[model samples]
Target: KYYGNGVHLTKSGLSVNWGEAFSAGVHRLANGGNGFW
Candidate 1:
């Protein structure tokens, strides 16, 4: 399991996974800095 903030790729295929904090950060970045702050 991931133990940090970031995205990851599954071992099976091109599937993607993300850390909780990382996903929130990404959304904030995408929405002009309005994330889980």
Candidate 2:
């Protein structure tokens, strides 16, 4: 069974799945900063 049963996040923390992580990065970029200019 390739693509097993569907799943969703129930919780979050540092180093989350890619989608969540990427959003964090994009948000920081919007602020023109991410630890470094």
Candidate 3:
């Protein structure tokens, strides 16, 4: 999915183009604070 910029990341893994989950703003899967939502 799109992680804001031109980065394409997976749902349960690290951000491919951004690198690291924290850097992509994904604190946790249940945190509901990251992603395009």
Judged by whole-model lDDT over C-alpha atoms, candidate 1 comes out at 0.54
Highest-TM-score candidate: 2
lDDT of candidate 2 over 1-37, digit per residue (tens): 3333325333443346666769989988888744554
- Report every candidate's CA lDDT: 0.54, 0.58, 0.50
- Candidate 2's displacement at residue 25, Å, is 0.8
Q: Which ten residues in a row have the lowest lDDT in candidate 3?
A: 6-15
- Report model 3's TM-score to 2 decimal places: 0.17
C-alpha lDDT (0 to 100) for residue 28 of candidate 2: 80
Give TM per candidate: 0.33, 0.39, 0.17
Q: Give the TM-score of candidate 2.
A: 0.39
On the 0 to 100 scale, the lDDT of residue 23 in model 1 is 78
Off by over 4 Å in 1: 1-18, 33-37
lDDT of 3 by residue, 1-37 (tens): 5445543244544445347545556556457755666
